[PDB]
A paper describes a structure:
The IL-17 family of cytokines and receptors have central roles in host defence against infection and development of inflammatory diseases. The IL-17 family of cystine-knot cytokines consists of six members: IL-17A–F, which exhibit differential binding specificities to five receptors, IL-17RA–E. The most well-studied IL-17 cytokines, IL-17A and IL-17F, are produced by T helper 17 (TH17) cells and are elevated in the context of inflammation. [name] (also known as [name]) is a key regulator of type 2 immune responses and driver of inflammatory diseases, such as allergic asthma, and requires both IL-17 receptor A (IL-17RA) and [name] to elicit functional responses. Thus, IL-17RA serves as an organizing hub mediating IL-17 family signalling at the membrane by acting either as a direct receptor for IL-17 ligands or as a co-receptor.
Numbering used by the authors:
A (entry chain B), B (entry chain A): 74 to 144, 155 to 177
C (entry chain C), D (entry chain D): 19 to 57, 62 to 72, 78 to 112, 120 to 272
The structure:
Amino acid sequence: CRASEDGPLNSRAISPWRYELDRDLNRLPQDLYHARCLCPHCVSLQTGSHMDPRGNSELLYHNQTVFYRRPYCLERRLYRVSLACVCVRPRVMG
Amino acid sequence: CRASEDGPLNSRAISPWRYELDRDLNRLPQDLYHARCLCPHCVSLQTGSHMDPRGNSELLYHNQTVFYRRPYCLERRLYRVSLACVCVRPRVMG
Amino acid sequence: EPTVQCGSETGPSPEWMLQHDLIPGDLRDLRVEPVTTSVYSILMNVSWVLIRLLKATKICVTGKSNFQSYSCVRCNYTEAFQTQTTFSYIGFPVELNTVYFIGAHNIPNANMNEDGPSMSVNFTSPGCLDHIMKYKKKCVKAGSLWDPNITACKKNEETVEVNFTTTPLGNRYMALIQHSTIIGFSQVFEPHQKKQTRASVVIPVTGDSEGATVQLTPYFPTCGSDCIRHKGTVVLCP
Amino acid sequence: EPTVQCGSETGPSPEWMLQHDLIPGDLRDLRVEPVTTSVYSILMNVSWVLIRLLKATKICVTGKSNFQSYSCVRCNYTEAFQTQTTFSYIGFPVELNTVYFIGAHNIPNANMNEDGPSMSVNFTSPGCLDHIMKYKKKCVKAGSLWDPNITACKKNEETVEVNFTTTPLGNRYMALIQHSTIIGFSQVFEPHQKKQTRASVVIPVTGDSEGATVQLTPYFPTCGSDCIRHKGTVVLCP
Ligand SMILES: *[C@@H]1O[C@H](CO)[C@@H](O)[C@H](O)[C@H]1NC(C)=O
Ligand SMILES: *[C@@H]1O[C@H](CO)[C@@H](O)[C@H](O)[C@H]1NC(C)=O
Ligand SMILES: *[C@@H]1O[C@H](CO)[C@@H](O)[C@H](O)[C@H]1NC(C)=O
Ligand SMILES: *[C@@H]1O[C@H](CO)[C@@H](O)[C@H](O)[C@H]1NC(C)=O
Ligand SMILES: *[C@@H]1O[C@H](CO)[C@@H](O)[C@H](O)[C@H]1NC(C)=O
Ligand SMILES: *[C@@H]1O[C@H](CO)[C@@H](O)[C@H](O)[C@H]1NC(C)=O
């Protein structure tokens, strides 16, 4: 849960995220890497090392085109890969 | 540029983005919407009405399967739509 | 004597590719309004005010809010309408917190390498923070109906004691205290009890917290870390 | 006596759809390293350590930073090699500020309802912020070459004057003064002059600025708003 300087853009954002693996034996590509938000809350720009609770870590999603070798025969369905996290301001009721 | 409370995440983010219209009478979808960062610098989580000079704004891009009506006939070429702005830390050397 | 029959089709229309020697005009006016059906469920209302050669009309709506969504509906015409002696339609399910860009064009439309595009209207769906749509399936499970009834008492300069009513949904809760900067941050765990349903949390604070703002964020598994929040203020208790 | 030949192909392999009663094994080892070609160009070095029935192994390049990366090439063999008595490949460019995940699997591969996938290796490609990769075409315009010689002098408590060399690249400059919080903020426009290349900027400040860090931010049109900055410290000037 820290922000570095070189990057690229994954260790440089206020709410960083790490790339996790999802493997399948009939998908193109074989290896997909979703976005997983690591820091529960956004970090302070004063240091960039430690987190502050004033913000929220909310994922974003888009639909990616994948091909499935379902019994051979090919298949085309929309797939769900999280692209990146954003720091959104909270909702307060009352 | 400012952050509101209801949403969605476009008027609620530290680096807000408004959607511009790119109308093409030979593209499917006929209307797309790129994200344009109205904030040159990121907003304070204290208020969200005013920005802070300690941050930077950077877009993310993706390849979205659109269709073009080139001479009619169908054809497939990826297009580079701007999804959202995210807040990224400065790079400082000397 | 025309009537409105409407359906669903997304993607390429058959007349989009084909050419047409003569082209209809265009929809002179177009309007959209939100109308709620009695029980909730919400459906979009599309009413437009409009020649002899004319076939149908297509409506496409796009939603862009933390997700991607795209739907289209074409409404056909039953028979020609020469008389001057304005239609409407109810055909789109509306989500929560979603901006909608809606545009319609007559079919057939302007041939390629020619101008005269259509016009569009815009509208933003109501959120979950209002009273009308606070009974939705998502909102109540996300915490719209829960009433914490926060009563936080400042014990002393360093410690603050917070009372809040619990719920069966969650067991761990955030805690924030923001006046000008962050002076209080803590994490707690509490088991839910039917006999006793009030909590007591002690949090250390740095600096004078008198008159601060108490912000309660629950950890409900169904809404992640971006869950709804409830207001609280420092109340001095004798 | 096998030899290395490699082409390029992205998508589904002709053996991906087909099935095979007998399936070969897998690569014993695969190590990927970066190599530099003398003039610059940066290229990853792909080398795998490798039964009687076997044809080829595919190499793919995939990583993600602000973007995606996706390219695949094949690598045929010429003859079978029963002899017990190492292969390599140089065919892939390296981008700027991108992570890289390299994927390789023998052909043919395992069928459905089976095990034995391929492996992957990590790699972190440094950006152009290092002196070896400091003259690259893109960010050399973005300010790698420029030496500000930034010198900050404080006249009095309210104002600080900033002395620095101007460049023909930029005309409008923004500044940061950050020691504990933001105490200084201004925006100035200065035209570069061939006769005199040494400009003056006045920026008012709030509070005691002794010991602060003066930080410069140029609006060079090639780098937008994420341009490289240059560190400077306040110097008490007689
Ligand atoms: C309108 O006519 C087209 C022509 O085939 C047809 O495909 C479509 O289903 C019709 N619309 C409705 C609502 O039936
Ligand atoms: C959306 O509609 C509103 C209605 O006044 C208009 O002001 C705005 O320019 C429209 N925006 C787009 C992107 O169509
Ligand atoms: C908060 O809860 C504690 C639990 O022991 C209780 O003693 C205290 O009286 C409560 N606060 C108020 C204002 O009743
Ligand atoms: C590799 O072998 C395949 C299979 O015959 C062939 O189609 C392809 O052209 C070959 N590529 C090279 C570079 O030899
Ligand atoms: C990076 O290396 C570690 C161990 O060295 C491994 O566990 C991890 O899976 C690698 N990263 C990816 C994306 O595979
Ligand atoms: C900074 O620039 C101005 C420009 O005239 C000059 O007068 C001043 O002496 C410079 N600062 C120093 C320390 O020389």
